[PDB]
Design a protein that fits this description.
The structure is a homodimer.
Chain A: H1 3-10, H2 14-22, E1 30-31, E2 37-38, H3 41-55, H4 60-71, H5 77-110, H6 116-121
Antiparallel strand pairs in A: 1-2
Helix pairs in contact in A: 3-4
The structure holds copper (I) ion (2 copies).
Protein name (chain A): HTH-type transcriptional regulator CueR
Domain HTH merR-type (chain A): 1-69
Function (chain A): Regulates the transcription of the copA and cueO genes. It detects cytoplasmic copper stress and activates transcription in response to increasing copper concentrations.
Chain lengths: 122, 127
């Protein structure tokens, strides 16, 4: 598999894949006899794990540590669980912040005859 | 008011104020005898609206349009529409975050959370 196929399969863009390699977050790709990057299922799983971990909120470092745990046959599921529960609490806080913004925008809108919205924001 | 007074009052850095002016997001201030930007209460209102708008969800372009509506003598409905569209955007964001949280908590409950390598969180977050 070349990087194009990997992008199509993982949904990640070529830039992101290269970015993760540059950051040393994934097992480096191999080079073909021609000098071009080739990958294996191992790279796909690692990249897939990275794409999904980012989607849920883990920063770059956290996501990479998740890749390390994935590659470690002697991993402790307790460590993955602890990191996940910590991530959940963060998402709860993020949810609360958005609900606060939503509450404010709705209070303004309901006060608007359709302007209390612009006068109060300004 | 000079740019520094405006930075203090609005809580924006003088660099940010210059930026908003440069992107034509706010009215260009006039110039004093010595060539310095002089701001009026109007500039304070635009900058504040721009800061508040962003803080509550609108992106730069959207906030700039809000400033346009602000200075317009005439749009109660056009603003209420934008506002209600932003909330729908936030509720969707909220919905997505709730779904991710639920997914992670489902996997966590399935996780042995012990010293064994078998981990459904890792296994399902990967391939
Ligand atoms: Cu309104
Ligand atoms: Cu686990």
């Amino acid at each position: 598999m070349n990087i194009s196929d990997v992008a199509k399969i993982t949904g990640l863009t070529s830039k992101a894949i290269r970015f993760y390699e540059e950051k040393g977050l994934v097992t480096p790709p191999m080079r073909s006899e021609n000098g071009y990057r080739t990958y294996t299922q191992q790279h796909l799983n690692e990249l897939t794990l990275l794409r999904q971990a980012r989607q849920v909120g883990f920063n770059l470092e956290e996501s990479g540590e998740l890749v390390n745990l994935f590659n470690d046959p002697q991993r402790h599921s307790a460590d993955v669980k602890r990191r996940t529960l910590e991530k959940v609490a963060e998402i709860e806080r993020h949810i609360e912040e958005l609900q606060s913004m939503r509450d404010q925008l709705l209070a303004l809108a309901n006060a608007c005859p359709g302007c209390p919205i612009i006068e109060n924001l300004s």
